[PDB]
């Protein structure tokens, strides 16, 4: 219960460019209430900015600096929503 | 800032063996949001992965293929955590 009811989507969960923000959204509504957390694993640090919007919807953007393969993960009460973690490739600026 | 509230330990921070996955763990729940970085320095490349599980424990595992003296760094928000880097003797199979 809880996590399976959450949904996320965006460009940020399918591909990104080194240096340029990768955005996506999460919708909780229908799940319990508690805590959403987002994590990025890969060959470089990630700057993650977070926004709860008075919509019961939440919006995310992060930056990474190195090409390579990353894993973005969204978790509700410390467990993965459907499709988390998302295998997200990063390529160099054009 | 914040790295001083992070702890690590386990057999992978003490010795390891070539071709054999080596494990240790990190406690972060007392430092909140941030970034971990793990570096492994020495004679050959390492494969590394986190295991972030539903306890809220954080695990690291790595595999190097060559005997020798490696060093495992663990920093949080670019600062070293207590006792990092770690001198890790990696012995033959």
């Amino acid at each position: 219960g809880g996590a399976h009811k959450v949904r996320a989507g965006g460009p940020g969960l399918e591909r990104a460019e080194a240096g340029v923000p990768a955005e996506f959204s999460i919708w909780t509504r229908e799940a319990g209430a508690g805590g959403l957390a987002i994590a990025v694993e890969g060959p470089s640090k990630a700057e993650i900015s977070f926004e709860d919007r008075k919509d019961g919807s939440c919006g995310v953007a992060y930056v990474v600096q190195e090409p390579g393969d990353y894993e973005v993960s969204v978790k509700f009460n410390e467990e993965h929503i459907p499709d988390s973690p998302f295998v997200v490739p990063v390529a160099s600026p054009s | 800032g914040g790295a001083h509230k992070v702890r690590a330990g386990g057999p992978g921070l003490e010795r390891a063996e070539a071709g054999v996955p080596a494990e240790f763990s990190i406690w972060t729940r007392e430092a909140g949001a941030g970034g971990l970085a793990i570096a492994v320095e020495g004679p050959s490349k390492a494969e590394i992965s986190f295991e972030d599980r539903k306890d809220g424990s954080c695990g690291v595992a790595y595999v190097v293929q060559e005997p020798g003296d490696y060093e495992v760094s663990v920093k949080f928000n670019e600062e070293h955590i207590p006792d990092s880097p770690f001198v890790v003797p990696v012995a033959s199979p």
Partner: peptide
Amino acid sequence: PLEKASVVSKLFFSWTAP
């Protein structure tokens, strides 16, 4: 010939508040 060469392997993990 006086250099030290070694291999350096990195992984990172950044995560978020609530």
